[PDB]
Design a protein around this ligand. Structure first.
Ligand SMILES: [Zn+2]
Ligand SMILES: [Zn+2]
Length: 825
């Protein structure tokens, strides 16, 4: 039995080397792993050319269901096990088996012997030869003798370690058994004090992880650029150990020093480190000290992950969780009879070479990532429950030929069983299983992970939408009304009137929802209770809310006012807007309380504008007179300047008109006191010299919408949309739950992706006739057989306006890359 530390292919095909730990110290052995590919060659009779030394067998494995490939045709799939050397020497010639007629495509031609060994053999490798010397002087062959033993423990770790770091001239080194520190081109005292202070800060962690790595050390701050080779050589000839590497240029540092290829190295890339241009010494000292004194915890976590995942030490990374999922799923499918369609250095599934061709169905199924939502405006005097749904994707996965857009159900069932055992193991005190299940969704979304497929993503998204609509239907079965719906938030109207009487009601509804077999894995949390709500949009609402209802005590009520509409008013009328909004909300609360104390119409609110109509009329008259007097004054023109904000498209002149229009449109959401509001609106419009049904007296949305779907926060594995026009700042740049700043170039890149996808979608549209709405079914024709000329499904003005709003968004923030993206058109 041997614990493998690293797998690595050589420069010779079919040859591999491993830094392995024999009973004594570490040792390197030469490995030989052959190649295996999948072929669909000829229909049933083939030019065998069997004189070439290879093993050929016909199998009945499962093929990927390419939507373009709707024709089964021949199905005589073949298995080919063939050494890489003969593969390379026959690739030069043309008249060979791999290149002939009726070659449909190779399915497993990109799996290097590195991957084949790392998944087929694992870290726990041994010998059962029963020629050891002949196999140790040469490379010992595997395909005849190979088996994996148990790996519940890797080895008792007592070895030296190495440190190599770079912070973009900040080359760094440290030795576990050394007692000196030198930094390449006040500092020493700061180094000592920071070491001591964080030593008492993390006494406990240091004591726990001392057995992995073990103290004060000397300080030095070092023509000089050649000493890296000298240090690496002296470390090589002084000790045989593992090296911790941390830099944004891992490959460059590997290529600069040739001695690095001779030792087993673990990479710990945490890149994107920068300097503050001033006072860099303490921040770099903090970085170095936390790195060196948290390397123990880092290596402990790596050891746990490796000794659980049956993968060697050097093949794992702290953030590379997708790789473990890929290797274990591929191993399970290899034990099955399904082709892996594994791919490298390309974010596409391997379909035999067909995948590189453009196709309409595929291009439609990649770019349809928008998630619909429900919003029913209105004013509610009833109590409303704000609930949150969690772990929806995992529940959707676990719960639930003719169709060409169907994903292979065999793989779906395999991954469902995988996730079921994952859930069971995570239940029984397993942090690794819980973290992996959490990262499953991010693995599903991310195409950078290998073994990716767009069909599976589309299938999962469709099933998630169906599950959400089923949940809405279930919530609608009892007495309830859906105000807003989303992947994360659901607002439900409760028939009752007092929040204190909805304790058992809400608890019973949550219990009944949870007990349903379809929704057994949902986590439901209630956040807020709404006494009185004025809801018109996600970013536009106001009402009185209580956090959680208490017993024997009146609840603490706090009013909220979130109105992005207020940002489009003149800087002189916004105080009036907020004051009048507070006044009307107070009046609505007063009238509802009076109605309740008394006992499509609801007398809870009917008759609320009677309290403030005359003061409002007088205030509007005074505002109109003051605006008339002080609008053309030069020094008084500061407060009448109309603000400009991205997404704005309305050109208006008189700010008081928009003030009263907003103040009336917020009222017009009642849907039960419409006549009173209309009379008040007419009376207000009589102050101006306008009429009831004029176009200038019609309210519109002063802002457009530009939403980026499914932005991922790695710090939470959290999925939500983001509105670049309507959402306020300090929320575009940070996650909703965690307050961690987003990376800006990712935002700009996703915006560019959205714009390019929009352009392609417009260019790939279909043509529809004018009178009848039948689709154009001829590659060339003047017009419809009946009367009428063709028109496109996507109009030009829509995409023109979208490009305009992209310009506005790119101009408001500092986005140079998006500006250059537009300028190249
Ligand atoms: Zn977050
Ligand atoms: Zn027609």
């Amino acid at each position: 039995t041997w614990e493998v530390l690293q797998y690595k292919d050589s420069g010779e095909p079919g040859v591999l080397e491993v830094f392995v730990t024999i009973n004594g110290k570490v040792q390197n052995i030469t490995f030989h792993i052959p190649k295996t590919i999948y072929m669909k060659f000829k229909s049933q009779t083939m030019p065998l050319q069997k004189i070439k030394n290879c093993l050929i067998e016909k199998s009945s494995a499962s093929l990927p269901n390419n939507p373009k490939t709707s024709n089964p045709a021949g199905g005589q799939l073949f298995k080919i096990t063939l050494p890489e050397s003969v593969f390379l020497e026959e690739k030069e010639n043309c008249t060979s088996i791999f290149n002939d007629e009726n070659v449909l495509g190779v399915f497993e031609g990109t799996i290097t012997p590195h991957q084949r060994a790392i998944m087929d053999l694992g870290a726990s490798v041994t010998f059962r030869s029963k020629a050891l010397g002949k196999g140790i002087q040469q490379g010992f062959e595997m395909k005849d003798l190979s088996m994996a033993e148990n790996e519940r423990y890797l080895s008792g770790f007592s070895m030296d370690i190495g440190y190599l770091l770079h912070f973009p001239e900040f080359f760094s080194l440290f030795k576990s058994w050394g007692d000196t520190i030198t930094i390449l081109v006040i500092n020493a005292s700061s180094l000592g004090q920071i070491y001591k202070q964080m030593f008492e800060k993390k006494k406990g962690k240091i004591e726990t992880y001392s057995y992995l790595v073990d103290i004060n050390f000397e300080f030095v701050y070092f023509k000089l650029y050649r000493r890296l080779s000298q240090e690496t050589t002296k470390l090589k000839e002084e000790r045989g150990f593992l090296l911790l590497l941390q830099s944004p240029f891992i490959t460059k540092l590997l290529g600069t020093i040739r001695l690095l290829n001779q030792m087993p190295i673990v990479k710990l890339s945490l890149n994107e480190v920068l300097l503050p241009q001033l006072n860099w010494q303490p921040t770099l000292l903090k970085k170095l000290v936390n790195h060196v004194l948290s390397s123990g915890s880092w290596i402990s976590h790596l050891i746990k992950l490796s000794q659980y995942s049956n993968i060697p030490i050097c093949n794992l990374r702290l953030d590379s969780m997708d790789y473990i999922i890929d290797v274990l799923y591929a191993r399970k499918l290899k034990k099955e009879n399904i082709v892996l369609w594994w791919n490298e250095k390309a974010p596409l599934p391997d379909h035999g070479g067909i995948q590189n061709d453009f196709d309409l169905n595929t291009s439609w199924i990649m770019n349809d990532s928008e998630f619909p939502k429900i919003n029913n405006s209105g004013v509610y005097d009833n109590v409303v429950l704000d609930v949150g749904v969690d772990n929806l994707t995992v529940n959707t996965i676990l719960t639930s030929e003719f169709v060409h857009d169907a994903f292979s159900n065999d793989a779906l069932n395999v991954l469902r069983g995988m996730l079921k055992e994952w859930w069971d193991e995570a239940l029984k005190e397993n942090s690794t299983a819980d973290l992996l299940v959490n990262s499953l969704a991010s693995w599903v979304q991310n195409p950078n992970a290998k073994l990716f497929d767009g069909l599976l993503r589309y299938h999962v998204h469709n099933l998630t939408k169906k599950a959400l609509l089923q949940l809405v239907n279930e919530f609608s079965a009892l007495g309830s009304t859906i105000v807003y719906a989303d992947r994360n938030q659901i607002l439900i109207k409760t028939n009752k009137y007092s929040p204190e009487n909805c304790y058992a009601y809400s608890q019973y509804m949550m219990k009944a929802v949870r007990t349903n077999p379809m929704f057994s894995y949902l986590d439901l949390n209630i956040k807020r209770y709404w006494d009185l709500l004025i809801w018109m949009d996600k970013f536009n609402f106001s009402g009185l809310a209580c956090i959680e209802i208490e017993e024997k005590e009146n609840q603490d009520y706090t009013a909220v006012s979130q109105w992005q509409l207020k940002k489009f008013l003149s800087p002189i009328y916004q105080p009036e807007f907020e004051d009048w909004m507070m006044i009307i909300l107070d009046s609505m609360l007063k009238t509802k309380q009076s109605y309740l104390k008394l006992n499509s119409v609801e007398n809870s609110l009917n008759g609320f504008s009677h309290l403030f109509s005359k003061p409002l009329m007088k205030r509007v008259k005074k505002l109109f007179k003051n605006q008339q007097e002080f609008i053309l004054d030069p020094q008084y023109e500061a407060d009448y300047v109309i603000p400009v904000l991205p997404g704005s498209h309305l050109n208006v002149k008189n700010p008081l008109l928009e003030l009263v229009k907003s103040l009336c449109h917020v009222m017009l959401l009642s849907k039960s006191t419409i006549l009173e509001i209309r009379t008040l609106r007419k009376e207000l419009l009589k102050i101006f010299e306008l009429r009831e049904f004029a176009k200038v007296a019609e309210f519109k949305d002063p802002s457009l919408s530009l939403v980026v779907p499914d932005f991922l926060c790695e710090y939470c594995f959290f999925i939500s949309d983001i509105d670049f026009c309507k959402a306020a700042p300090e929320s575009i740049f940070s996650c909703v739950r965690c307050h961690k700043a987003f990376n800006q170039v990712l935002l700009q890149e996703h915006l560019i992706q959205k714009l390019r996808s929009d352009i392609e979608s417009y260019l790939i549209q279909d043509l529809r006739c004018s009178r009848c709405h039948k689709v154009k079914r001829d590659y060339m024709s003047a017009h419809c057989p009946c009367a009428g000329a063709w028109e496109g499904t996507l109009p030009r003005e829509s995409i023109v306006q979208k490009l305009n709003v992209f310009k506005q968004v790119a101009k408001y923030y500092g986005f140079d890359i998006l500006l250059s993206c537009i300028a190249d058109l």
